[PDB]
């Protein structure tokens, strides 16, 4: 279990992946990360599955509070008539690493954050969302770890990469876009920081990495965390998932549009607020 | 509504009391403040309705975290196998001050904190409790306010008292022991700090206050917040409510025992940890 690596996706598919191989050992399919039906009626707030932040489209920008932070603080009342009301259930899961059942198993706990906004001025609720998240510790810059992660936004492509050199460990494709990584630490989950990159850009990198790997025939090269950050332009990616609009940070390469109900128009990359 | 005063009790009876009179204008009966059935099985943690703190009886002492703080932080896992799992629903209530119904009404919001502990070593849950609380702002030392409050622990007796002089404004009796006071501020609730005193002691004060009021025939005198604090000894009161044990701070006068399943023995006042 210390060898395995947990991977969380937008459709609620937690995959237990062997870090070295990059393939899936077993998977847990449960409730999906972001479910926002109020955006169907009026889209105003834009959640972020990576941690739980919220953005507002009045133009696109980031808010000071996450959905979890807004749920715990709630109930409250705004200057505007709208009042906030949250709910935060805690579910746990236990399944044998092989699968009074078998002992020394793995106990995983997650959350159901659920925020709701009702405008006092109006006669109807003005927003609503349901955000899940796995309970795990904070990321630290551990020297024991020798990997890093690049994940496409809007597509389930993962590129695992040696921490120091950047040489590709494994590129893999999961059904739904990945949102978070967790490795087993202190008999529990510890979140692993990753780097969101544009799917177009990420695919573009993966091909050239194979091209340089073929021509040189020495090592398939992939950039380090800092190199991409300096080289690639930042962008705020907007996406959709089953009639639910979300936002996230992202990196684009040259030749990609980035902005400074028509769902699709707002979808894509925007300039970092 | 700015004239009225909200009063919360252990049986979930929020009373809207006129501050000057001290009598009840209307009441809202809902779910009670503290419901702890796990203490029935094993009593370990002792909640406090005044704000939500927890005490442990291994001897009697206070914990660093409240039930709300423990609910929001949860889920988690302790060094001992036991894992924590919380739930925090947010309910609101609107009733006309007279009672698309009548406008300019009062919207009151409360919470259902619900914490649970299950020992991994054991095969059964080790604790469980459900604590309510009304959503309201913090108390400030406002000069506009000219009152203070003494409440008995384990009995529903309230002694309202002029802030400066200490002269009794009104002594009143409510069915269930009061837990919190809220006054309408900024079109919302603002918590009002009160002073918990032993019922025996409080009754003792109320009689002598009437005695000095009769003999002198000038003013029924009651002590100020500081005088009682200096004069009266502190004690940690333990009580019960429908097979649920709780604890709270309290003040005792001379001639009252204070300690340095037999439910009843632990009930009463103990030395401040």
Numbering used by the authors:
A (entry chain A), B (entry chain A): 29 to 85, 91 to 132, 148 to 308, 356 to 368
Paper text:
In eukaryotes, the endoplasmic reticulum (ER) is the central organelle for the synthesis of proteins destined for secretion and membrane insertion. To ensure that the environment for productive protein maturation is maintained, both folding capacity and the inward flux of newly synthesised proteins are regulated by a pervasive negative feedback signalling pathway, the unfolded protein response (UPR). IRE1, conserved in all eukaryotes and therefore the best-studied UPR transducer, detects ER stress via its luminal domain (IRE1LD), initiating dimerisation-dependent autophosphorylation of its cytosolic domain. An alternative hypothesis posits that IRE1 is repressed by interacting with a major component of the ER folding machinery, the heat-shock protein (Hsp70) chaperone BiP.
The luminal domain of the broadly expressed alpha isoform of human IRE1 (hIRE1αLD) also crystallises as a dimer, with an overall architecture similar to the yeast protein, however, barring conformational changes, the MHC-like groove is too narrow to accommodate a peptide. Hence, it has been proposed that the structure of Zhou et al. (2006) represents a ‘closed’ conformation of the peptide-binding groove that can shift towards an ‘open’ state to allow peptide binding. To confirm these observations, we made use of an alternative assay reporting on IRE1LD’s dimerisation status. To this end, we employed a modified IRE1LD Q105C that forms a disulphide across the dimer interface, creating a covalently stabilised dimer when placed in oxidising conditions and the aforementioned dimerisation-compromised versions of the IRE1LD (W125A and P108A). Differential scanning fluorimetry (DSF) revealed that the melting temperature (Tm) of disulphide-linked IRE1LD Q105C SS was ~10 °C higher than the Tm the wild-type protein, a Tm difference that was effaced by reduction of the dimer-stabilising disulphide. To gain insight into the mode of MPZ-N binding to IRE1LD we made further use of the disulphide-linked IRE1LD Q105C SS. The crystallised IRE1LD Q105C SS dimer proved identical in structure to the wild-type protein (root-mean squared deviation (RMSD) of 0.46 Å over 227 Cα atoms) except for the presence of a conspicuous density corresponding to a C105-C105 trans-protomer disulphide, thereby locking the proposed binding groove in the ‘closed’ conformation. Nonetheless, a fluorescence polarisation binding assay, using FAM-labelled MPZ-N, showed that binding to the IRE1LD was not compromised by the disulphide, leading us to conclude that MPZ-N does not obligatorily bind within the proposed MHC-like groove of the IRE1LD. Our findings do not support the notion that this peptide specifically engages the MHC-like groove traversing the dimer interface, as a disulphide, crystallographically proven to lie across this groove, thereby locking the helices in a ‘closed’ conformation, had no effect on the binding of MPZ-N to IRE1LD.
